[PDB]
């Protein structure tokens, strides 16, 4: 028995509303780079804590600042003048005081964070040399903790909600949402990079739906070592446009789709989106945590959104992070239920109570025609109760990177 | 012009069963970053104007606050480790005298550092900017791509620097007004003079269930003005009565609970004491775009833009302009009889004049009104505002409107 609430939502689903706007910041976008680093550092520390204590100690590395470097793009080959400066911040448990054993145990927080951040950049930025193109600085607050408190956490019980916070999620994705998401995913896949190496990873996708007309506006950074002139630049744009048109036919078949790329380009004056490294982080743009995608990987002003930044937050006891991920997992499964058209899940914690015993879990369902919500309700409540029972499994999925925070 | 108007047949937020609203006050780490970011942007605007008569490309919407360390105590505590603040972003650092064939550097760094220091002096009465804070600066030169887009039609209508959207809505609900005005009052010079023990790091959350509003306030107390746990208690209760008085003025007809510093533990004397009036001194971090929207609120029950207005230039960054513009438009539409609620979403296309790919308007009508009577009045309001978009830019520079 939990405070789980099911209510029939008698509104039009977003899919059927007249207008929609969705944005996604791809992996190479500076803001998304920071989110990715922030979460990579958290996961790294999680693995660090478990490998010496078999549990996770308190930390929060949801603070990462990317300062744009200096660069000179040029057709055929560009120059990286001065490196990107990334500052790691936040806090983390570093030294454990054991009064009984009269011993101090210090953990490699700073070195782990720097390594984690560096290895993540290596993965997502193909045309960056992290040895020379990036500076990874660290000012993470390294705090202490009594080993008696470590012993209590080693029990690995369900943590108590230390705050009254909330999370929100929904499913399924609309056609527009799915198209914005998969466009970025595909343009950052190994398979496409191999066919069009000029496509950088700093990809920003904006989807506008008007009735059944979807307009995709893409900001795509081009790697200048793969285009020797404006002519080949134009060709990359049109090839990508074709590839995205092909993708739209697989997702939004039935819609009118327009695709626009780097609309601020001036082909004449050769004022175009050219980069040395494939990311505007090299000079054009700066970045930080929590001003991009939500945990479902989208920016959605026609859906509810938490302003809270999930990336880098403690997966153990941070309500916001856990509930936003949890809400989307619950909504996703409920959306698989026969008779469910759209599903919203809102979760609210009770401070002092276990995290998987919320003050209120609101399941709002838009039903398919001729379906009884009261037939769907018991199935929906079981799904929600199932995930809450397996709250620790959700925390595992986060550390293992099975779920996303941006 | 692509203005879209829709009827929205739902309960307005005022009538919905549940609501959650939040505001991070001036002294909150995140709001400090927003405020400094905007201070730097405005200072640079003034500097560029005085030097060339025109605003040059910049975006200083990037400030990182690394929390310091302090040791609060009744009667007066001590700062242990200074707060580290990093000023970042893009700016025109230099210009080229083609005739002399020589680079002329502009005073971006000194302007930015002084602006940040001046702002901190205003919002944190009890901080010592000489020892409690480090202000570093790594603002760099922007790329050649957007300084062109910035310049292509600066004398005409500026071209949008980017493809982004801003959102706005009106009117504010009772809970939203209460959260907003509570913070505004507790951070007014009027109250500070009456109760100097009130720090500026004030976080206010409003939770509504039906017609019951629970207002939860996290309020930093300045330890030099409280001799003991008893004087501390008096400040809590004094403020509590002040907010109750305010709630009677705003929340007429609602049950209003007011909880302050609920995490306090008087037994072990573990309360919200601070030396400087902000949690930043205690390791709380902050950055730009992590808190309030331009309406001054964090609202999961309302549409929001993730664009951080603070620090973005008022010339051609729609992330700033459209978020301000959307709220001005929504405000006027809400004045119309028959309109209960209005939502405005404005989408740009990078390369197009800032005056939109789509201007979206949703209206919740009064139960006995036609949208077709309202729709023409809406599109006119939206058009009039797009026509006078440059006056909005003026209001931002002049600081007649805030970005958080």
PDB file of C-alpha atoms in Angstrom, chain B residues 278-372:
ATOM      1  CA  UNK B 278      24.490  33.111   2.011  1.00  0.00           C
ATOM      2  CA  UNK B 279      24.823  29.325   1.906  1.00  0.00           C
ATOM      3  CA  UNK B 280      27.596  29.841  -0.656  1.00  0.00           C
ATOM      4  CA  UNK B 281      29.913  30.267   2.334  1.00  0.00           C
ATOM      5  CA  UNK B 282      29.068  26.701   3.384  1.00  0.00           C
ATOM      6  CA  UNK B 283      30.006  24.854   0.197  1.00  0.00           C
ATOM      7  CA  UNK B 284      26.772  25.401  -1.731  1.00  0.00           C
ATOM      8  CA  UNK B 285      27.627  25.801  -5.413  1.00  0.00           C
ATOM      9  CA  UNK B 286      25.929  27.846  -8.109  1.00  0.00           C
ATOM     10  CA  UNK B 287      25.848  28.515 -11.832  1.00  0.00           C
ATOM     11  CA  UNK B 288      23.801  30.394 -14.430  1.00  0.00           C
ATOM     12  CA  UNK B 289      20.373  29.250 -15.606  1.00  0.00           C
ATOM     13  CA  UNK B 290      19.846  26.906 -12.651  1.00  0.00           C
ATOM     14  CA  UNK B 291      17.075  28.862 -10.938  1.00  0.00           C
ATOM     15  CA  UNK B 292      14.332  31.376 -11.632  1.00  0.00           C
ATOM     16  CA  UNK B 293      12.943  32.100 -15.075  1.00  0.00           C
ATOM     17  CA  UNK B 294      12.543  35.738 -16.154  1.00  0.00           C
ATOM     18  CA  UNK B 295       9.195  35.880 -14.329  1.00  0.00           C
ATOM     19  CA  UNK B 296      11.214  35.220 -11.173  1.00  0.00           C
ATOM     20  CA  UNK B 297       9.829  31.736 -10.544  1.00  0.00           C
ATOM     21  CA  UNK B 298      10.472  28.010 -10.962  1.00  0.00           C
ATOM     22  CA  UNK B 299       7.228  26.412 -12.098  1.00  0.00           C
ATOM     23  CA  UNK B 300       6.863  22.710 -13.006  1.00  0.00           C
ATOM     24  CA  UNK B 301       3.102  23.254 -13.532  1.00  0.00           C
ATOM     25  CA  UNK B 302       3.762  25.952 -16.147  1.00  0.00           C
ATOM     26  CA  UNK B 303       5.640  25.913 -19.456  1.00  0.00           C
ATOM     27  CA  UNK B 304       9.320  26.858 -19.127  1.00  0.00           C
ATOM     28  CA  UNK B 305      12.259  27.705 -21.356  1.00  0.00           C
ATOM     29  CA  UNK B 306      15.701  26.321 -20.509  1.00  0.00           C
ATOM     30  CA  UNK B 307      17.364  29.390 -22.031  1.00  0.00           C
ATOM     31  CA  UNK B 308      19.207  31.398 -19.374  1.00  0.00           C
ATOM     32  CA  UNK B 309      18.308  35.045 -19.993  1.00  0.00           C
ATOM     33  CA  UNK B 310      20.885  36.427 -17.558  1.00  0.00           C
ATOM     34  CA  UNK B 311      24.099  37.484 -19.285  1.00  0.00           C
ATOM     35  CA  UNK B 312      22.878  37.080 -22.863  1.00  0.00           C
ATOM     36  CA  UNK B 313      23.147  40.269 -24.929  1.00  0.00           C
ATOM     37  CA  UNK B 314      19.981  42.375 -25.317  1.00  0.00           C
ATOM     38  CA  UNK B 315      20.747  43.004 -28.998  1.00  0.00           C
ATOM     39  CA  UNK B 316      20.144  39.709 -30.820  1.00  0.00           C
ATOM     40  CA  UNK B 317      19.923  36.817 -28.343  1.00  0.00           C
ATOM     41  CA  UNK B 318      16.325  35.621 -28.377  1.00  0.00           C
ATOM     42  CA  UNK B 319      17.017  33.424 -25.349  1.00  0.00           C
ATOM     43  CA  UNK B 320      16.831  36.703 -23.449  1.00  0.00           C
ATOM     44  CA  UNK B 321      14.527  38.770 -25.662  1.00  0.00           C
ATOM     45  CA  UNK B 322      11.753  36.243 -26.365  1.00  0.00           C
ATOM     46  CA  UNK B 323      11.472  35.160 -22.728  1.00  0.00           C
ATOM     47  CA  UNK B 324      10.937  38.799 -21.742  1.00  0.00           C
ATOM     48  CA  UNK B 325       8.739  39.492 -24.769  1.00  0.00           C
ATOM     49  CA  UNK B 326       6.588  36.407 -24.190  1.00  0.00           C
ATOM     50  CA  UNK B 327       5.663  37.580 -20.693  1.00  0.00           C
ATOM     51  CA  UNK B 328       4.834  41.120 -21.811  1.00  0.00           C
ATOM     52  CA  UNK B 329       2.528  39.749 -24.513  1.00  0.00           C
ATOM     53  CA  UNK B 330       0.901  37.218 -22.181  1.00  0.00           C
ATOM     54  CA  UNK B 331       0.358  40.022 -19.683  1.00  0.00           C
ATOM     55  CA  UNK B 332      -1.634  42.225 -22.077  1.00  0.00           C
ATOM     56  CA  UNK B 333      -3.693  39.353 -23.488  1.00  0.00           C
ATOM     57  CA  UNK B 334      -4.635  38.441 -19.915  1.00  0.00           C
ATOM     58  CA  UNK B 335      -6.098  41.934 -19.455  1.00  0.00           C
ATOM     59  CA  UNK B 336      -8.691  41.157 -22.124  1.00  0.00           C
ATOM     60  CA  UNK B 337     -12.169  40.355 -20.827  1.00  0.00           C
ATOM     61  CA  UNK B 338     -12.993  36.697 -21.427  1.00  0.00           C
ATOM     62  CA  UNK B 339      -9.374  35.586 -21.007  1.00  0.00           C
ATOM     63  CA  UNK B 340      -8.720  33.581 -17.842  1.00  0.00           C
ATOM     64  CA  UNK B 341      -5.182  32.422 -18.657  1.00  0.00           C
ATOM     65  CA  UNK B 342      -2.727  33.048 -21.487  1.00  0.00           C
ATOM     66  CA  UNK B 343       0.396  31.147 -22.548  1.00  0.00           C
ATOM     67  CA  UNK B 344       2.920  32.572 -25.012  1.00  0.00           C
ATOM     68  CA  UNK B 345       5.722  30.613 -26.683  1.00  0.00           C
ATOM     69  CA  UNK B 346       7.982  32.338 -29.220  1.00  0.00           C
ATOM     70  CA  UNK B 347      10.337  30.410 -31.518  1.00  0.00           C
ATOM     71  CA  UNK B 348      13.117  31.990 -33.575  1.00  0.00           C
ATOM     72  CA  UNK B 349      15.172  30.820 -36.514  1.00  0.00           C
ATOM     73  CA  UNK B 350      18.859  31.737 -36.372  1.00  0.00           C
ATOM     74  CA  UNK B 351      19.582  34.190 -39.184  1.00  0.00           C
ATOM     75  CA  UNK B 352      16.113  35.757 -39.228  1.00  0.00           C
ATOM     76  CA  UNK B 353      15.236  39.215 -37.823  1.00  0.00           C
ATOM     77  CA  UNK B 354      14.330  39.042 -34.128  1.00  0.00           C
ATOM     78  CA  UNK B 355      10.956  40.620 -34.949  1.00  0.00           C
ATOM     79  CA  UNK B 356       9.828  34.720 -35.281  1.00  0.00           C
ATOM     80  CA  UNK B 357       9.510  31.321 -36.952  1.00  0.00           C
ATOM     81  CA  UNK B 358       6.343  31.014 -34.885  1.00  0.00           C
ATOM     82  CA  UNK B 359       4.630  33.040 -32.164  1.00  0.00           C
ATOM     83  CA  UNK B 360       2.348  30.656 -30.283  1.00  0.00           C
ATOM     84  CA  UNK B 361      -0.606  31.724 -28.127  1.00  0.00           C
ATOM     85  CA  UNK B 362      -2.818  29.506 -25.968  1.00  0.00           C
ATOM     86  CA  UNK B 363      -5.844  30.994 -24.210  1.00  0.00           C
ATOM     87  CA  UNK B 364      -8.085  29.588 -21.496  1.00  0.00           C
ATOM     88  CA  UNK B 365     -11.328  31.497 -21.972  1.00  0.00           C
ATOM     89  CA  UNK B 366     -13.924  32.352 -19.353  1.00  0.00           C
ATOM     90  CA  UNK B 367     -16.665  29.717 -19.536  1.00  0.00           C
ATOM     91  CA  UNK B 368     -19.007  32.053 -21.468  1.00  0.00           C
ATOM     92  CA  UNK B 369     -16.755  33.613 -24.125  1.00  0.00           C
ATOM     93  CA  UNK B 370     -15.849  32.899 -27.749  1.00  0.00           C
ATOM     94  CA  UNK B 371     -12.192  32.470 -28.719  1.00  0.00           C
ATOM     95  CA  UNK B 372     -13.002  33.991 -32.113  1.00  0.00           C
TER      96      UNK B 372
END
